[PDB]
Amino acid sequence: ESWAQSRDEQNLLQQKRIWESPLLLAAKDNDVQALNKLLKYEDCKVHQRGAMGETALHIAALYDNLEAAMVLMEAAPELVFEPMTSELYEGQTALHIAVVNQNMNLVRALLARRASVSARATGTAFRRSPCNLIYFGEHPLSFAACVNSEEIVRLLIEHGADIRAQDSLGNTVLHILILQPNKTFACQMYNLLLSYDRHGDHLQPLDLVPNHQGLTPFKLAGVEGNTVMFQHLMQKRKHTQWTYGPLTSTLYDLTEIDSSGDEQSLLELIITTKKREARQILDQTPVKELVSLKWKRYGRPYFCMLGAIYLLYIICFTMCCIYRPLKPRTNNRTSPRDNTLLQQKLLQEAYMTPKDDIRLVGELVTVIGAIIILLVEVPDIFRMGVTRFFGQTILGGPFHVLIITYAFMVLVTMVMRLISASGEVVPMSFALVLGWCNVMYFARGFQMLGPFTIMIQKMIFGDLMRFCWLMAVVILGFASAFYIIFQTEDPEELGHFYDYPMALFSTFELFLTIIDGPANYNVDLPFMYSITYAAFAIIATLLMLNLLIAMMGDTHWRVAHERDELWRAQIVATTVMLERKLPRCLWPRSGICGREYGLGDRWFLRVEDRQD
Amino acid sequence: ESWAQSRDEQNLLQQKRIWESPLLLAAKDNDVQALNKLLKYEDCKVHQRGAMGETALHIAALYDNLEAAMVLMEAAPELVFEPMTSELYEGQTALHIAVVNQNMNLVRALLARRASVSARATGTAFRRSPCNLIYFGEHPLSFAACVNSEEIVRLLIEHGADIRAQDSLGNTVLHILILQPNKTFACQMYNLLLSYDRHGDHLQPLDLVPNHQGLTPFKLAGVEGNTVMFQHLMQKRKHTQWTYGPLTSTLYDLTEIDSSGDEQSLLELIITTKKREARQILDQTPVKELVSLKWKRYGRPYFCMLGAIYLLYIICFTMCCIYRPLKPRTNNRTSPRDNTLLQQKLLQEAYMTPKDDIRLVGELVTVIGAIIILLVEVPDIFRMGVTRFFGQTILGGPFHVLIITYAFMVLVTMVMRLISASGEVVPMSFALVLGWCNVMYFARGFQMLGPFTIMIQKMIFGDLMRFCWLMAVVILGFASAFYIIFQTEDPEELGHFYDYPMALFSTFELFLTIIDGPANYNVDLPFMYSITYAAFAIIATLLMLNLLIAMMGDTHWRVAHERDELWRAQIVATTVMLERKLPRCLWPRSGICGREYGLGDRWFLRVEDRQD
Ligand SMILES: CCCCCCCC/C=C/CCCCCCCC(=O)O[C@@H](COC(=O)CCCCCCCCCCCCCCC)COP(=O)([O-])OCC[N+](C)(C)C
Ligand SMILES: CCCCCCCC/C=C/CCCCCCCC(=O)O[C@@H](COC(=O)CCCCCCCCCCCCCCC)COP(=O)([O-])OCC[N+](C)(C)C
Ligand SMILES: CCCCCCCC/C=C\CCCCCCCC(=O)O[C@@H](COC(=O)CCCCCCCCCCCCCCC)COP(=O)([O-])OCC[N+](C)(C)C
Ligand SMILES: CCCCCCCC/C=C\CCCCCCCC(=O)O[C@@H](COC(=O)CCCCCCCCCCCCCCC)COP(=O)([O-])OCC[N+](C)(C)C
Ligand SMILES: CCCCCCCC/C=C\CCCCCCCC(=O)O[C@@H](COC(=O)CCCCCCCCCCCCCCC)COP(=O)([O-])OCC[N+](C)(C)C
Ligand SMILES: CCCCCCCC/C=C\CCCCCCCC(=O)O[C@@H](COC(=O)CCCCCCCCCCCCCCC)COP(=O)([O-])OCC[N+](C)(C)C
Ligand SMILES: CC(C)CCC[C@@H](C)[C@H]1CC[C@H]2[C@@H]3CC=C4C[C@@H](OC(=O)CCC(=O)O)CC[C@]4(C)[C@H]3CC[C@]12C
Ligand SMILES: CC(C)CCC[C@@H](C)[C@H]1CC[C@H]2[C@@H]3CC=C4C[C@@H](OC(=O)CCC(=O)O)CC[C@]4(C)[C@H]3CC[C@]12C
Ligand SMILES: CC(C)CCC[C@@H](C)[C@H]1CC[C@H]2[C@@H]3CC=C4C[C@@H](OC(=O)CCC(=O)O)CC[C@]4(C)[C@H]3CC[C@]12C
Ligand SMILES: CC(C)CCC[C@@H](C)[C@H]1CC[C@H]2[C@@H]3CC=C4C[C@@H](OC(=O)CCC(=O)O)CC[C@]4(C)[C@H]3CC[C@]12C
Ligand SMILES: CC(C)CCC[C@@H](C)[C@H]1CC[C@H]2[C@@H]3CC=C4C[C@@H](OC(=O)CCC(=O)O)CC[C@]4(C)[C@H]3CC[C@]12C
Ligand SMILES: CCCc1cc(O)c2c(c1)OC(C)(C)[C@@H]1CCC(C)=C[C@@H]21
Ligand SMILES: CCCc1cc(O)c2c(c1)OC(C)(C)[C@@H]1CCC(C)=C[C@@H]21
Ligand SMILES: CCCc1cc(O)c2c(c1)OC(C)(C)[C@@H]1CCC(C)=C[C@@H]21
Ligand SMILES: CCCc1cc(O)c2c(c1)OC(C)(C)[C@@H]1CCC(C)=C[C@@H]21
Ligand SMILES: [Ca+2]
Ligand SMILES: [Cl-]
């Protein structure tokens, strides 16, 4: 807001103090004849610093003024060593600038003037941020490599440019090229810069150097969705075994893709990132064949078993709620509006007969089953990234919120049964609904409508937490009208609107056409009802056909196939969670070993494919 | 109708009187040998004027007869000075014609015959109108420039063609080129004609000369939706500050785009025009970045505050209507069809207890709030273009009609309470509905379904004020049938149709399936009912599935993305109204100044963008 406004005030102040100076102006427009006049006249202030803290040499280099920049370097050689001093462009020298503008003849000069190639452009304008349109890094080489100047990138290496130099974020130049928008020019520079990693004594060669998040360039390529570079960095891991005409048997490596157990593997990093370009990586030729093997072999069995153990558990919860304790009421009917006939038994008479002891079994089976839920779900939360990283791994798993809410209500139900509290129907009735509707989750195993509850969970897009605001306002408006219309009338005839809370429920039901329009026809209703209700039935009918449309254009001219892509992302998110929770004995590690084959101690995957 | 018919009768009469003349015919077909015979024979009527008032020279020039036209100019030189005299092609000379037909060798001659280049083609066929297929202006240069003849446009300037000459509408030649259908040939002529604005003493140079609507060529380009020329006229306003490799920092001017406060700025002229090509301008690179800054900074706050102050106001109106004065009725039940139990209290007993004084507070809060509405909305109307320009600024604001109707009903409610009038439910029940459903407007702030109440307000297209005619006819037809079928029967059994007004309401409800089909089954209904109602349920079911379709094809094969364009047009229309109503202190002017930067007294905007 104001910081963006404060950039502008400096960029204009920058152009102001150029005009308010004879030196900084002559550099901008390359008036050498009027520049020699100024440098010769007096041992002037050559350290004139404009708004961004920049000397005349920055400005000669910022506007591609080769001829001006030499004169500054001839007059006072101290200028090449001068960085900008402002908080915005801090540390930046004239060398960084000439590289970005690709001024080949100027950059050669500043190196001939022994300019530092290790100078670190720390300013805020270079850090990675959506406020900045560029992330070229922090060093001259990182700037050269991202503008695609093969010549300058070489030229800086003869002068001692450490390729292993990292940013504040730890990203060496190999990470940055993955973060650029132009992919095709970035793969060619990736190859060139490793070629200058010649010397055998390097202690974790460049493409295995992680940043301050632990990510290598390979894993960074997946998190950012750079499909081009993920492929290009993958031929280092292939090993073509044999080729028999149209057949090929490649042997992928999977050391950074498969869950080892020490650091989060690439499949965990693609699910735990907000981007949707990263989910394209799950279609690539080493990964697609691994996800479909964890699942087809060891992910559908352990998910269509724990989806049937849950069903036989909720069927036991259910029968413990149908057959609950209930006795005839002991009070008397207070008002004629009280049709309560029964109330729930106290403990001393709830468990007093054989049929109530079969139930106690099922009720202990239940509440033990709810504690278990809170011992395999809450310890994840309380130990893991309690609320930010939890829902981050969640792609289509609101399940984990509901089933913890299930187990909570079951325990509320227990306590209330122990202290003989009135109102056990309130917790149960949540637990029933939350308990069964979680069985909608144990469906994706077979490609049920679980690939299509992707929709109803994708249907927490805009027009379904947002059509509330323009439906609820209709309900509150006509319900408050309907109420005052029948506020004078006899409710034993038409009693849809006898109190304000029932006027909203009735009006909610009338919006959806799940009760019939009020009518008696043996009594004169108000004339002000039929006018009002005719409009409600119209606003309600049209708002239920702008949303059918809105749910359509957000599905057909918009996404209908990335839902099939979203399925493959839930197959992973499921597979990862099971492999994290289930023990190693039930989960054989995917891929074949290498110790008994001479390939090392890595865990390869073989893929046999036909070219054409 | 008849005026178009009267053009034709002259165009045929024009060809008639050519055939009924030996002179006008010889010109049409270029018979010089039979033309010299006619001019030499006798000092003839060379002033023969056909239907449109045209002499032989117009016709030689209208049909590209170079050889005939010279003979007329050699015989009698007085012809070049002769305009057409008819009301349709008034003022037009032979010079105007040769320019349009691009006859390069003929036009040189008429200038050699000292023909006026200031002659003003005033006729109705040249004025701007949908009845005319061309608007080439009123002068020879304006005709040359719109046919794209670089040669003739130059050639008229050596002979003294004032470029600053304006039409009856004030449009100089620079405005006209924007109004042409061919854009690409018009940008090149725009450049050429300013080049001939050399002399420094001009007193508002050409591209700052307004027409009789005050619009300059820049502002005219936006009103007309000429995206090509809006861009082309915008490089005069850019000022590229610096270029750092792929980065560019341009400094746009915004003097004619932003609301200064003296004349309506370009953002006000694009909303207040009926065209939809003009709304394309809101996506261009100086304007898109300004709308999104007024809003993101100073338009969502002042719109999500006055949208919550309104909600707490209607919640107070509501509670003042639930808790209204009501007492048991004093009369007796007239007929058994009267289930009115209560009636409303008189003033003397309406405010008699502490609970009725808390309400008086909320009722004064209310009616003060309705006067305020009528002091910030009616003074706009009564002062502004009361009914034509009001709804012109309205793009998606029927809100302004409803909220004035709200405040009116609240004051009707007041008066009726002061004079103890019966029927306060009628005004309230409008005010409730109009009051809440206006909260659907204070939603666009967050990109609610307010971008999608664009639909339901776009849904006042054809098939929703127009499907009425083919639904209402079904209702009136079967309701008048249902009525006469049960006009003989006992209504205490089936009384959906006991009077004609309830027969239309019931039938309205049955069309929409918001009440159940009539039935008793303990009594023999007419056989003529089941035949009729079976057809109604079919016509009703099919007419509710031709419109689902009609609302679809008008959304999916038709517009689904210009609604996203329509949002950005309401962001402006909202932003303009707030900036007009709210004071200057709460509204800092957008864009940075120039006085403290040497750029002048203009109000620039900086945009930093990455090329590729
Ligand atoms: C974790 C370890 C334990 C934690 C603490 C344990 C708590 C222990 C104590 C709790 C409550 C205090 C004692 C009982 C109150 C009696 C007063 C009364 O009249 O109650 C009435 C209402 O019912 C209630 O008031 C019961 C409240 C249910 C639990 C809290 C709400 C949970 C859902 C909140 C929403 C969350 C949203 C979730 C969204 C998914 C009685 O019920 P009734 O229906 O009026 O009529 C009888 C019904 N019956 C005869 C048919 C059966
Ligand atoms: C701005 C400054 C002030 C202006 C002048 C102030 C005017 C002052 C005086 C006005 C009316 C004259 C006195 C009362 C008439 C009594 C006769 C009678 O039987 O009435 C009946 C009908 O109700 C009416 O006749 C009331 C009329 C309401 C106001 C006018 C209509 C506004 C909406 C028009 C549409 C516009 C379309 C809008 C589209 C959005 C009585 O009501 P009831 O329902 O039959 O039964 C009682 C109801 N109750 C007990 C439940 C409460
Ligand atoms: C996105 C989803 C939104 C939420 C869903 C929204 C819909 C539903 C949600 C919530 C509605 C809750 C209303 C009922 C609770 C109030 C008290 C009550 O029960 O009735 C009392 C009256 O109370 C009133 O008259 C106050 C009603 C004012 C409006 C309340 C909603 C405010 C907006 C907030 C929501 C923003 C909505 C979004 C758009 C702005 C008593 O009534 P009674 O017993 O008949 O006695 C009457 C007295 N008499 C007999 C003397 C005459
Ligand atoms: C469009 C804008 C809004 C329309 C009118 C605004 C409102 C009306 C305007 C003003 C107030 C009413 C007039 C004075 C009193 C008359 C008698 C009366 O109150 O009610 C009587 C009949 O009602 C009528 O005879 C109403 C006559 C008005 C026109 C009919 C409205 C419907 C048609 C237009 C439809 C438009 C769509 C048509 C198709 C496109 C009986 O009704 P009640 O409730 O039994 O009365 C006694 C109640 N009490 C015992 C409690 C006392
Ligand atoms: C775009 C939206 C259009 C508007 C909505 C359209 C639908 C609704 C709008 C309006 C309908 C209004 C009808 C009711 C008012 C009339 C009087 C009345 O109430 O009943 C009286 C009878 O009256 C009649 O019998 C006359 C009905 C003739 C047709 C009226 C509509 C004309 C078309 C105009 C519209 C063009 C529609 C467009 C297509 C052409 C009395 O009835 P009763 O009390 O039972 O007494 C009967 C006497 N008996 C007992 C002796 C037997
Ligand atoms: C398609 C064109 C239109 C159809 C026929 C046109 C009309 C009929 C033609 C002519 C008039 C009726 C015939 C004479 C009198 C018979 C008895 C009578 O009136 O009603 C009796 C039964 O009704 C019948 O028995 C009707 C017999 C005709 C054929 C059945 C029609 C439905 C089938 C075809 C469906 C087509 C779709 C099939 C699937 C595609 C009893 O009825 P009521 O009302 O209780 O009578 C007493 C009333 N009163 C006490 C007031 C006196
Ligand atoms: C008390 C004893 C004798 C009987 C009750 C045992 C089972 C019938 C219940 C109680 C514990 C339950 C489990 C506890 C928690 C979970 C984790 C949760 O599964 C997942 O989160 C897998 C999907 C994913 O992680 O994406 C929901 C099912 C499951 C296996 C439950 C399935 C049903 C179980 C095995
Ligand atoms: C007493 C209860 C029944 C009152 C009304 C229900 C509410 C308590 C709401 C709050 C949140 C709702 C739940 C939110 C999300 C879902 C997931 C949805 O299922 C899925 O998307 C697939 C299953 C999964 O992913 O877990 C089914 C409806 C359900 C259970 C909803 C059911 C109704 C709930 C429990
Ligand atoms: C009597 C006092 C003590 C309390 C009542 C004050 C407020 C709760 C009310 C009454 C005056 C109302 C305002 C009067 C008129 C308007 C203009 C109108 O807004 C617009 O037209 C903005 C959108 C646009 O112009 O496109 C509707 C809301 C607003 C600000 C109203 C919002 C709610 C306000 C501030
Ligand atoms: C006593 C009343 C309730 C009888 C029936 C209602 C009618 C008086 C009609 C006449 C015009 C209608 C209104 C015309 C347009 C709109 C805007 C529409 O909202 C929007 O398009 C967004 C809000 C806005 O832009 O103001 C919601 C329905 C509503 C309020 C309509 C509600 C019903 C109204 C008030
Ligand atoms: C909206 C388009 C697409 C279709 C046309 C529908 C409406 C404009 C019409 C159809 C019939 C009309 C109704 C016919 C009769 C009445 C009864 C009238 O009240 C009375 O006559 C009181 C006494 C009684 O109802 O017997 C109030 C207006 C109302 C509801 C009318 C309101 C407007 C309605 C719903
Ligand atoms: C989308 C616009 C909603 C709308 C606006 C209306 O004006 C009306 C509506 C619906 O339905 C009918 C025609 C039945 C009403 C009749 C009575 C009144 C007072 C109003 C009519
Ligand atoms: C703006 C007022 C006119 C109008 C036009 C309509 O097309 C419709 C209106 C009202 O309300 C009802 C509910 C009667 C129609 C039913 C059929 C459909 C799907 C649309 C509805
Ligand atoms: C779009 C055409 C509407 C239509 C036309 C009809 O001919 C009939 C219709 C509907 O529905 C059935 C078949 C139930 C009627 C049975 C009775 C009569 C007398 C007619 C039948
Ligand atoms: C022309 C007469 C034949 C006919 C054909 C139909 O297809 C339909 C007809 C009538 O009416 C009903 C309402 C029974 C059908 C219901 C299902 C749909 C959506 C269409 C309706
Ligand atoms: Ca029903
Ligand atoms: Cl559909």
Residue numbers in the entry:
A (entry chain B), B (entry chain A): 27 to 638
Q: What text does the study give?
A:
TRPV6 is a constitutively open channel. The TMD is composed of six transmembrane helices S1–S6 and a re-entrant pore loop (P-loop) between S5 and S6.
Cryo-EM micrographs for hTRPV6-CtD reconstituted in cNW30 nanodiscs in the presence of 114 µM THCV showed evenly dispersed particles with diverse angular coverage. High-quality reconstruction of TRPV6THCV identifies three such densities per subunit as representing cholesteryl hemisuccinate (CHS), which was added during protein purification. The second site is located next to the first one but it is more peripheral with respect to the pore, surrounded by lipids, including CHS molecules at the vanilloid site (at the interface of S5 and S6 of one subunit and S4 of the neighboring subunit) and at the interface of P-loop of one subunit and S6 of the neighboring subunit. Correspondingly, site 2 is unlikely to cause strong conformational changes in the protein and we propose that site 1 is the main inhibitory site of THCV. In contrast to the apo-state structures of hTRPV6, which have an open conducting pore, the pore in TRPV6THCV is in a fully closed conformation, hydrophobically sealed by the side chains of residues L574 and M578. According to the MD data, the only specific interaction that can stabilize the forward orientation of THCV is the hydrogen bond between the hydroxyl group of THCV and the carbonyl oxygen of L490. The rotation introduces a π-to-α transition in S6, making it entirely α-helical, causes a ~2 helical-turn shortening of S6, a ~2 helical-turn elongation of the TRP helix and repositions M578 so that its side chain points towards the channel pore center. In this position, M578 side chains hydrophobically seal the pore for water and ion conductance, finalizing the open-to-closed state transition. THCV therefore acts as a cog that inserts itself in a cogwheel mechanism of TRPV6 channel and ensures its transition from the open to closed state.
